[PDB]
Amino acid sequence: DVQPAARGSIVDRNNDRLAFTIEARAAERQDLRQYPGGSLAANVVGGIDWDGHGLLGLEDSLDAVLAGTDGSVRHKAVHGSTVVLTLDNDIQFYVQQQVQQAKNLSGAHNVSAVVLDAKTGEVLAMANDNTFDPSQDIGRQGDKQLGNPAVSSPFEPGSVNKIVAASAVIEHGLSSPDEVLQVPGSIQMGGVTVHDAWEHGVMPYTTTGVFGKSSNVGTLMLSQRVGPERYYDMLRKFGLGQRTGVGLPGESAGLVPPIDQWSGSTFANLPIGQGLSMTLLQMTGMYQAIANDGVRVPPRIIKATVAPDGSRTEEPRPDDIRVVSAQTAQTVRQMLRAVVQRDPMGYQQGTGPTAGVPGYQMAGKTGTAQQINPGCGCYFDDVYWITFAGIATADNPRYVIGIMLDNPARNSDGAPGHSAAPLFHNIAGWLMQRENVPLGPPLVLQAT
Numbered sequence: 018d019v020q021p022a023a024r025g026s027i028v029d030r031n032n033d034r035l036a037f038t039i040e041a042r043a044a045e046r047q048d049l050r051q052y053p054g055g056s057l058a059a060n061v062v063g064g065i066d067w068d069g070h071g072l073l074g075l076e077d078s079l080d081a082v083l084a085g086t087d088g089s090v091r092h093k094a095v096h097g098s099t100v101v102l103t104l105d106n107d108i109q110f111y112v113q114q115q116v117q118q119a120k121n122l123s124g125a126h127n128v129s130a131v132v133l134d135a136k137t138g139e140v141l142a143m144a145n146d147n148t149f150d151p152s153q154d155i156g157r158q159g160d161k162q163l164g165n166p167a168v169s170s171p172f173e174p175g176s177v178n179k180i181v182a183a184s185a186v187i188e189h190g191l192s193s194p195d196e197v198l199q200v201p202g203s204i205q206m207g208g209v210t211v212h213d214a215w216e217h218g219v220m221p222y223t224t225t226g227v228f229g230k231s232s233n234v235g236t237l238m239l240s241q242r243v244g245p246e247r248y249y250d251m252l253r254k255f256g257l258g259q260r261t262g263v264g265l266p267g268e269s270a271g272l273v274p275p276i277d278q279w280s281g282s283t284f285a286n287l288p289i290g291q292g293l294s295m296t297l298l299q300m301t302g303m304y305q306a307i308a309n310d311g312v313r314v315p316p317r318i319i320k321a322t323v324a325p326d327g328s329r330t331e332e333p334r335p336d337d338i339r340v341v342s343a344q345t346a347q348t349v350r351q352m353l354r355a356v357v358q359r360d361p362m363g364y365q366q367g368t369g370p371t372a373g374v375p376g377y378q379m380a381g382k383t384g385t386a387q388q389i390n391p392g393c394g395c396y397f398d399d400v401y402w403i404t405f406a407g408i409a410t411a412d413n414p415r416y417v418i419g420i421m422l423d424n425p426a427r428n429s430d431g432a433p434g435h436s437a438a439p440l441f442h443n444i445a446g447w448l449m450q451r452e453n454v455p456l457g458p459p460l461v462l463q464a465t
């Protein structure tokens with residue numbers, strides 16, 4: 018005769034329940050899995066099988082923790098432990114809803130977003146559009162997203178990768194935010210030709226402006242100062258090409274070609290974010306490093322487990338990784354404020370003015386990466402991954418936000434363009450309001 022273990026529950030950081038079991042009947046007694054939020058975080062949480070064991074998601078990957086072990090008679094029943102996630106359901110719900118309507122408004126194939134706690138790298142929200150509902154039969158949801166693209170599905174970052182170049186060039190003392198540069202409209206590098214997204218003669222962009230206006234040419238000129246080895250070294254320190262260990266099934270490691278295999282043109286591509294791929298989580302994790310004064314903390318979604326008696330064990334914190342100094346990180350945060358700076362005369366406006374929130378030192382970076390055309394082995398001309406990653410706020414980092422839009426026809430808010438900045442605006446602005454966070458001179462992107 019068998020004594021069944023009672024399945025543990027999955028809850029958020031404040032013990033708001035995401036998944037829990039109730040006892041019912043039909044093989045007479047039947048345990049019913051409940052999902053009071055429906056699709057809420059179902060990309061992370063997953064769903065249950067007919068036998069009451071995990072089918073996919075954390076229900077499956079932590080099944081042994083959640084299922085326990087059945088007793089007998091004499092062996093006692095080890096009931097399932099409760100899993101406490103780092104997620105905040107309120108933030109998850111808002112972000113997940115905003116991700117869905119950015120996908121609707123923008124016409125993108127898909128949208129995903131990640132919010133990290135800036136100091137600890139804990140995952141506060143992780144969402145994609147079209148999230149399935151685990152309270153319903155999965156075979157009836159082939160049109161739904163059943164997985165977790167934010168960790169499983171790498172993409173080329175494009176210009177949001179320029180945080181690496183910016184971090185290296187400041188960390189090695191090779192430039193400063195105010196340095197006046199001379200930036201041609203194109204250069205020949207590594208045997209290939211790199212253009213800026215707008216035609217221009219030599220422009221007196223500051224280093225700040227190179228990243229604020231997202232000059233590819235300016236980025237490569239600065240990267241020539243870093244050199245491949247210090248640049249590749251910093252890619253590795255920012256954690257690219259390597260799984261984070263976040264504790265979710267199906268995490269991709271992405272792809273960074275090791276320096277021993279680069280072609281002549283590789284260095285002309287990586288610093289502007291093409292020729293490598295990363296997940297949204299890796300992307301957001303890079304900006305977490307700069308937000309946490311240069312110390313990257315690998316993100317984590319399991320906060321703790323609670324044993325059946327009620328004793329709580331915290332998850333072990335991952336080891337700090339210093340990427341750049343605190344001084345360098347603070348300088349990059351300030352400089353990325355220029356990305357969201359507005360200028361009616363155009364000259365001192367970054368690529369993402371709609372992402373700024375007046376009253377706050379928002380800092381971030383836009384991205385537009387060309388996707389590979391699967392039929393030619395070559396890049397599409399008009400098919401993009403759109404990215405934004407930012408920090409709320411530069412003077413007091415609390416939240417890191419990463420966003421990717423898969424080839425939108427419009428802005429995330431539905432206006433003409435291809436920008437994820439309005440979605441950052443909405444999320445970061447709402448995060449400041451709800452915590453009642455309180456409120457200098459304009460930055461120079463372009464000299465004379």
Ligand SMILES: *C(=O)[C@@H](NC(=O)[C@H](N)c1ccc(O)cc1)[C@@H]1N[C@@H](C(=O)O)C(C)(C)S1
Nearest residue numbers: 175176177214231233368383384385386387
């Ligand atoms: C980084 O993402 C850069 N983008 C490109 O170089 C890309 N090939 C591209 C060129 C021209 C387009 O019309 C679209 C993509 C720079 N960063 C982008 C950004 O949004 O920040 C641009 C400013 C578009 S160029």
Ligand SMILES: [Co+2]
Nearest residue numbers: 089091092093
């Ligand atoms: Co025995």
Ligand SMILES: [Co+2]
Nearest residue numbers: 202203212216
């Ligand atoms: Co030209």
Ligand SMILES: [Co+2]
Nearest residue numbers: 426433434435
């Ligand atoms: Co267009």
Ligand SMILES: [Co+2]
Nearest residue numbers: 374442443446
């Ligand atoms: Co607004």
